[PDB]
């Protein structure tokens with residue numbers, strides 16, 4: 001019940017998975033998702049209520065307003081200790097491997113009790129050729145010296161990520177990571193920045209890096225996956241199975257292009273399946289805060305999730321097809337694997353049964369009973385026939401529609 | 409490789425062909441609120457044929473007289489339209505419980521199609537048998553077997569059997585049920601993760617086990633059918649394939665029960681991008697240029713619209729607002745895009761997909777200004793950029809008109 005002590009490069013046991021939320025950074029990079037300072041601050045406070053281990057709250061060098069907003073979060077959310085449990089979020093900020101960015105990071109985040117910096121540098125041939133116009137040797141010197149610089153400013157909690165790692169040569173990643181560790185990194189991330197990897201391929205990559213990098217046993221490996229081919233969550237899981245013990249996620253999966261790995265999906269996969277098919281890995285997210293966090297982020301960024309969005313979509317605990325309605329009414333475990341209380345979803349007024357074209361007699365019978373009707377089996381068949389006629393005219397049959405079928 | 413192979417229900421022309429089984433018009437329509445009119449179904453079926461799906465499952469004919477008639481029309485029209493130059497014609501598929509009324513309705517509705525198929529499904533998990541069917545394992549095996557024989561006696565030669573809730577069923581019981589299904593006449597076997605509980609390594613292990621332990625299963629096609637309740641439907645489908653499945657059951661936009669089915673566009677484009685490099689050569693024959701037209705049609709008719717970050721077909725997939733990503737894209741698109749938007753039916757985006765907002769950078773602003781005919785000094789650019797930073801506090805999206813004001817202040 002009490003929170004483990006925080007050591008940047010070590011975890012209390014072999015199953016703890018740190019949840020690193022970057023809704024306020026990678027998530028805000030989604031087109032149309034820019035947030036005002038009060039919105040970022042309210043979201044950060046709610047991410048602490050969700051009990052994320054780390055929240056990455058912005059990019060200090062980007063602007064005065066970003067710099068000042070981070071300071072405010074570092075001074076407030078970053079110093080608020082949960083009295084009973086001692087939970088304190090890590091406040092993280094991102095920087096390119098440049099002195100200007102890194103100085104902006106220290107000066108904005110140093111007020112937090114647990115400040116962290118992420119320094120990122122591209123390692124892929126494509127980025128080195130077209131983006132940075134640097135050689136592999138130059139990139140290694142820049143990674144190491146930027147990390148030494150962050151350490152000289154006062155950082156002890158330093159994360160390094162090889163941008164576009166998913167398209168980087170696996171042995172060059174180990175070389176960079178090895179120098180990153182020697183220079184002071186306590187967490188290493190290998191992001192699939194462009195969302196190209198398949199889960200077995202990403203897991204294979206993580207496993208290889210952890211087998212072939214000197215010193216890497218004594219730092220935390222972090223998965224950071226993007227969703228361009230629809231597998232960000234599974235890539236994250238595969239990273240965990242390959243030995244990653246931090247995962248970087250956003251609320252609702254917002255982020256660049258097709259987004260990041262959704263927090264609520266990675267966290268609920270571990271919650272449902274971690275003990276059974278994943279060797280006992282777990283997080284300490286308070287999953288009952290998921291829906292409140294999802295709703296706040298949707299309203300502030302303006303990116304609303306589709307009806308079939310996992311965990312927090314409108315349709316996740318709703319059933320319209322007769323055979324599924326019938327099973328749910330017999331026992332909800334027939335077609336639901338999660339209890340909605342666990343993710344903050346208020347319980348269905350109607351048990352999640354909605355009536356439409358494809359509904360069955362058990363559903364219709366069930367609803368009529370709720371509305372106070374004691375109808376015989378023959379009368380049910382007559383009402384159901386008229387209910388079917390009605391679904392050609394209207395898409396959703398309301399309680400009042402149902403009452404008129406009986407009454408009229 | 410331009411002509412489609414001859415269609416044999418239980419065989420494929422090579423070890424790498426993956427049949428795409430679209431169930432947008434049946435499992436997808438079961439989404440709360442997604443019910444479709446008959447003309448909407450028919451039009452979507454015609455569009456699925458242009459997408460070149462191998463099989464389209466078009467509905468549940470016992471469900472209603474209207475569903476029955478819609479299916480007949482599709483089977484008579486779309487189900488009989490051959491592209492002579494390539495040999496392409498879709499399989500028209502309908503679903504039935506393991507009940508004689510359902511299967512009789514299936515046959516009477518789809519028999520008109522040139523290639524009719526039926527899916528019979530029966531639960532096999534302990535939870536479903538206990539609480540839903542109230543049946544023993546021996547009852548279920550007998551029901552599976554006699555239902556497939558019955559389907560065969562009506563005229564069905566192309567028969568798929570699915571074990572509902574296979575993701576929570578005992579692996580050896582599935583093998584037992586599948587083995588009786590094969591003997592009865594099934595030519596495809598699906599192991600659905602009906603409730604979306606499996607992780608990818610787990611669904612892959614299950615498929616490998618079934619394929620290694622079921623007598624006769626080498627001579628039928630194995631089909632993955634995965635739901636998205638934990639966000640891994642697409643990945644589970646790919647683990648299915650890596651494990652030996654050579655049919656995938658998908659829906660456009662991933663619509664379906666609860667959190668949906670495996671999105672067709674994601675599975676197909678994953679195979680297009682990666683199949684030859686890390687998946688041993690598996691491939692589909694989908695015309696991916698029809699993805700966006702199909703996505704928009706299904707969205708409009710079901711009413712289920714995709715979020716901005718929906719893969720492949722979302723509004724943000726080929727759009728860049730952050731300065732460093734913009735700078736990368738303007739230097740070379742492959743820095744941050746792995747897919748060409750025209751490959752999936754997308755038009756190539758306004759202003760190279762560079763949109764200006766709070767997090768944009770100077771290269772983006774400079775490039776958008778150049779597009780408008782303004783070449784300015786670096787000093788002038790930095791002055792413009794400071795005013796840009798101020799403007800994004802008042803206006804979320806900076807337009808060409810805004811830029812004109814900014815550079816002429």
Ligand SMILES: CC(C)(COP(=O)(O)OP(=O)(O)OC[C@H]1O[C@@H](n2cnc3c(N)ncnc32)[C@H](O)[C@@H]1OP(=O)(O)O)[C@@H](O)C(=O)NCCC(=O)NCCS
Pocket residue numbers: 321322323324326327358359360361362363438468470471472503505506507529530531540541572
């Ligand atoms: C098919 C349909 C007409 C059945 O309507 P119904 O007779 O009123 O019965 P319900 O919808 O309430 O469905 C439950 C009945 O089917 C039984 N059943 C469910 N799945 C079954 C399966 N594979 N095999 C055999 N029986 C099954 C159920 O146990 C129940 O019957 P029972 O309680 O007498 O045992 C109606 O459900 C419908 O129109 N469905 C369209 C979409 C859908 O329901 N399911 C989509 C999955 S294919």
Ligand SMILES: CC(C)(COP(=O)(O)OP(=O)(O)OC[C@H]1O[C@@H](n2cnc3c(N)ncnc32)[C@H](O)[C@@H]1OP(=O)(O)O)[C@@H](O)C(=O)NCCC(=O)NCCS
Pocket residue numbers: 029059061062063094096097098120121122131132730731732733735767768769770771772
């Ligand atoms: C950071 C920021 C102020 C830079 O603004 P800028 O000076 O106008 O430069 P641009 O954004 O147009 O282009 C990026 C520049 O940084 C370089 N760069 C990109 N990644 C880098 C990295 N790890 N390390 C060092 N340099 C990097 C780029 O090459 C380019 O510089 P160059 O062409 O001179 O070599 C601006 O991009 C910004 O505000 N970004 C916020 C969101 C974002 O860009 N990225 C978020 C993901 S971390």
Ligand SMILES: CSCCC(=O)C(=O)O
Pocket residue numbers: 026118120160161162163164189191192193194224226
């Ligand atoms: C540690 S990753 C930082 C850059 C990033 O967000 C990405 O590469 O996707």
Ligand SMILES: CSCCC(=O)C(=O)O
Pocket residue numbers: 435527529568569570571572573598600601602603633
């Ligand atoms: C061929 S299996 C079809 C049954 C189904 O839709 C499911 O179990 O999800």
Ligand SMILES: [Mn+2]
Pocket residue numbers: 026191193224226
């Ligand atoms: Mn990222």
Ligand SMILES: [Mn+2]
Pocket residue numbers: 489490491492
């Ligand atoms: Mn023709």
Ligand SMILES: [Mn+2]
Pocket residue numbers: 435600602633635
């Ligand atoms: Mn299904």
